[PDB]
Amino acid sequence: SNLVLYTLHLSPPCRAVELTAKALGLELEQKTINLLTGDHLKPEFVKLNPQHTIPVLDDNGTIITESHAIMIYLVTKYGKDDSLYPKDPVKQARVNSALHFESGVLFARMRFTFERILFFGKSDIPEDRVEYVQKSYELLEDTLVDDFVAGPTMTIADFSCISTVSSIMGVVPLEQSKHPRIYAWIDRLKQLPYYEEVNGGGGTDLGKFVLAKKEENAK
Amino acid sequence: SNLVLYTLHLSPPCRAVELTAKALGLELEQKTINLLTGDHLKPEFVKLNPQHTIPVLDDNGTIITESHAIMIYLVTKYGKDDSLYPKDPVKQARVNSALHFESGVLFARMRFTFERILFFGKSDIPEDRVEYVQKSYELLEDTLVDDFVAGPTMTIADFSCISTVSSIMGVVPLEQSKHPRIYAWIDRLKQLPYYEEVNGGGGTDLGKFVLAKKEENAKA
Ligand SMILES: N[C@@H](CCC(=O)N[C@@H](CS)C(=O)NCC(=O)O)C(=O)O
Ligand SMILES: N[C@@H](CCC(=O)N[C@@H](CS)C(=O)NCC(=O)O)C(=O)O
């Protein structure tokens, strides 16, 4: 059977996989898991992922969870070149470091900001969580010593970072005066023909969704 | 020359790498970076890692940052076999999933709790902070369908998870009634001959260090 991705386009790590699929020329059949209606908490999905998160990949019965693991798996198995995820231990390590930076810092602090508005119905953002996001921006800025997060070549680490950054920057302002490297890096990824369709809209929408929910939770 | 690790024994991701080295029979020449005195904010270290975090590996001139990347690098580079990090894409994926669960959920929420006490002079642990850690316990509990976090075999994903869990559980209590899988899993890792030296001491000490700092901060 087909390669299936259990996903939601609003979700940043889901968009990270979609970008990877596009960059690989892979065809992923998408099946929508509506987080908002609690589809991910249903027993049929929990069976696939006990952590009940998306994205989840179904590769002919073989279940793979977590976006970064999925991306690594996809490049390893279906990549016809290792540009997106090098075989060389040193270069691969630099990608892995950036990938874990994304999950450990960028994404984690993004959801530490979003879920209080999204899940707990609050209409504010505590400044300590704001600053934590701001510092993640700074850390990302410092990491971009080359054209891309994991070096001079675009890798899956860029897909993971841009999917999160394009979502959180719509809620916590990412100043161009303080983070010019990030904006230049965003502009490189925007030159990807499939960027806007896959991530552009989704990221802007999630960011707008949070802001919309924030205002709505205030009425 | 041997491998150089810019490290601190109290640090969970540092101990995860040290666990990996011991499992690989590698000798790590440690260079201590005291975060409390801001050694990691020094220009010479920032050059090594612009994110100014530990651990950082120096393999004969080659710099590798971030514990999980380092752990993968060590097994790939010096592993006599791949049991700690499989070459097989599927089993490898299960490990990677666990690794990113640790940094994305386990460690992140621990840092969300610890950092403000250790560095920002705070003395309280808000209940939403506690809640979120508790929720990480449940997620780990539900992930342990096998004896180890990424399957029947012990992998570097267990090293990453235990180093964080053994630190956070001393602060935010892990109740045995709700998490029997975690406790059994912890007992398995404690059977490793190098566990207490490499992680069992450091993990307990960090949790104790947080509580001590929390007490001292509260006393103005
Ligand atoms: N590190 C994981 C995080 C995935 C994740 O947290 N997804 C969110 C959507 S952005 C989710 O499924 N939330 C539902 C839940 O945690 O219960 C990955 O990249 O796959
Ligand atoms: N995902 C990273 C996290 C590393 C990390 O956050 N280390 C802490 C010590 S527990 C640190 O260096 N903090 C200093 C800082 O962030 O400025 C890894 O596992 O290497």
* CATH number, position B198: 1.20.1050.10
Residue B85 pairs in a beta bridge with: none
Residue A159 and residue A71 share a domain: no
CA-nearest of B6, B14, B15, B12 to B49 is: B6
Tokens at A37, concatenated: 């209606």
Hey, is the C-beta of B94 within 8 angstroms of any chain A C-beta?
yes
CA-nearest of A135, A90, A185, A66 to B65 is: A90
Name A217's Cβ contacts closer than 8 Å, sequence gap at least 6.
Answer: A117, A121, A122, A123
Tokens at A36, concatenated: 């908002």
- H/E run at residue B90: helix B89-101
Tokens at B179, concatenated: 């998490």
Strands A56-59 and A29-32: unpaired
Q: Are A52 and A112 in contact (CB under 8 A)?
A: no
The CA angle B114-A149-A173, to the nearest 5 degrees, is: 65
User: Residue A186: phi, psi to the nearest 5?
Assistant: -60, -40
Q: Are B133 and B113 in contact (CB under 8 A)?
A: yes
Tokens at A153, concatenated: 């070549």
Could you tell me what percentage of chain A is helix, strand and coil, using 3-state DSSP and rounding each to the nearest 5? 60, 10, 30
**Ligand 1, closest atom to CA A12?**
10
CA-nearest of B171, B166, B207, B208 to B190 is: B166
- Measured on CA atoms in the order B162, B164, B170, B172, is the torsion positive or negative? negative
Q: Are residues A73 and B93, on separate chains, in Cβ contact within 8 Å? A: yes
Q: Tell me if B96 CB under 6 Å of ligand 2.
A: no
Residue B33 and residue B119 share a domain: no
- Output the residue whose Cα is nearest ligand 2's atom 16: B53
Tokens at B70, concatenated: 């380092």
- Within a 10 A sphere around the Cβ of A89, how many other Cβ atoms? 18
Domain boundary among B79, B94, B121: B79
Q: Are residues A64 and B139, on separate chains, in Cβ contact within 8 Å? A: no
Q: What is the largest CA-CA distance in chain A?
A: 54
* Binding residue ranges of A for glutathione: 11, 40, 52, 54, 67, 111
Residue A115 and residue A65 share a domain: no
- Within a 10 A sphere around the Cβ of B12, how many other Cβ atoms? 27
Cα–Cα distance measured from residue A197 to residue A60, given in angstroms and rounded to the nearest whole number? 27
Residue B91 and residue B73 share a domain: no
- Within a 10 A sphere around the Cβ of A141, how many other Cβ atoms? 18
Cα–Cα distance measured from residue B147 to residue A78, given in angstroms and rounded to the nearest whole number? 31
Helices (H) and strands (E) in chain B, counts: 10, 4
Strands B28-32 and B3-7: parallel
Ramachandran region, residue A86 (left: φ > 0; alpha: ψ -120 to 50; beta: rest): beta
- Quote the minimal CA–CA distance from A96 to chain B in Å: 5
Count Cα neighbours of A209 within 13 Å in the Cβ-side half-sphere: 18
What dihedral do alpha carbons B102, B107, B108, B113 form, nearest 10°? 150
Ramachandran region, residue A81 (left: φ > 0; alpha: ψ -120 to 50; beta: rest): beta
Hey, is the C-beta of B137 within 8 angstroms of any chain A C-beta?
no
Hey, is the C-beta of A62 within 8 angstroms of any chain B C-beta?
yes
Which of B19, B39, B46, B54 to probe ligand 2 with, by most ligand atoms within 8 A of CB? B54
Q: Are A161 and A139 in contact (CB under 8 A)?
A: no
Q: Are A86 and A151 in contact (CB under 8 A)?
A: no
Domain boundary among B59, B79, B99: B79
Which of B7, B53, B66 to probe ligand 2 with, by most ligand atoms within 8 A of CB? B53
Ramachandran region, residue A214 (left: φ > 0; alpha: ψ -120 to 50; beta: rest): alpha
Count Cα neighbours of B95 within 13 Å in the Cβ-side half-sphere: 27
| Residues B128-139: b if buried by 16+ CB within 10 A, e if exposed | ebeebbbebbeb
CA-nearest of B147, B132, B143 to B185 is: B147
Count Cα neighbours of B152 within 13 Å in the Cβ-side half-sphere: 0
User: Residue A176: phi, psi to the nearest 5?
Assistant: -75, -25
Q: Are B42 and B96 in contact (CB under 8 A)?
A: no
Residue B196 and residue B160 share a domain: yes
Hey, is the C-beta of B117 within 8 angstroms of any chain A C-beta?
no
Where are the strands (E) in chain A, listed by range?
Answer: 3-7, 29-32, 56-59, 62-65
- Within a 10 A sphere around the Cβ of A164, how many other Cβ atoms? 27
Residue B95 and residue B162 share a domain: yes
Total tally of structural domains belonging to chain B: 2
Cα–Cα distance measured from residue A185 to residue A183, given in angstroms and rounded to the nearest whole number? 5
**What distance in angstroms lies between residue B114's CA and the mean position of ligand 2's atoms?**
12
Residue B28 pairs in a beta bridge with: B3
Cα–Cα distance measured from residue B105 to residue B142, given in angstroms and rounded to the nearest whole number? 14
Residue A189 and residue A104 share a domain: yes
Residue B71 and residue B173 share a domain: no
Tokens at B195, concatenated: 């566990």
Task: Determine the 3-state secondary structure of A174 from DSSP.
Answer: coil
- Within a 10 A sphere around the Cβ of B208, how many other Cβ atoms? 14
Residue B63 pairs in a beta bridge with: B58
Chain interruptions in chain B, by residue before each (C–N > 2.5 Å): none
Residue B64 and residue B128 share a domain: no
* CATH number, position B30: 3.40.30.10
Cα–Cα distance measured from residue B20 to residue B70, given in angstroms and rounded to the nearest whole number? 9
User: Residue B16: phi, psi to the nearest 5?
Assistant: -65, -40
- Measured on CA atoms in the order A170, A111, A140, A7, is the torsion positive or negative? negative
| Residue range of the domain that includes A1 | 1-79
Residue A203 and residue A113 share a domain: yes
Tokens at A182, concatenated: 């990030």
| Residues A108-129: b if buried by 16+ CB within 10 A, e if exposed | bbbbbbbebbbeeeeeebeeeb
Which amino acid does the sequence have at B139? L
> Cα–Cα distances in Å, from B55 out to A5, B73, B189?
34, 13, 22
Q: Are A194 and A158 in contact (CB under 8 A)?
A: no
**What distance in angstroms lies between residue B53's CA and the mean position of ligand 2's atoms?**
4
> Cα–Cα distances in Å, from A168 out to A55, A108, A157, B115, B210?
19, 11, 17, 22, 30
Cα–Cα distance measured from residue A135 to residue A139, given in angstroms and rounded to the nearest whole number? 6
Q: Are B89 and A73 in contact (CB under 8 A)?
A: yes
CA-nearest of B14, B21, B4, B20 to B61 is: B4
Give the number of whichever ligand sits closest to the CA of residue B56: 2
Cα–Cα distance measured from residue A13 to residue A103, given in angstroms and rounded to the nearest whole number? 9
Domain boundary among B19, B53, B79: B79
Expressed in Å, this structure's resolution amounts to 2.3
- Quote the minimal CA–CA distance from B65 to chain A in Å: 6
Report DSSP state, residue A28. P
> Cα–Cα distances in Å, from B93 out to A127, B16, B87, B157, B214?
36, 19, 10, 11, 38
Residue B100 and residue B21 share a domain: no
Residue B24 and residue B119 share a domain: no
Tokens at B6, concatenated: 């810019």
Cα–Cα distance measured from residue A190 to residue A199, given in angstroms and rounded to the nearest whole number? 10
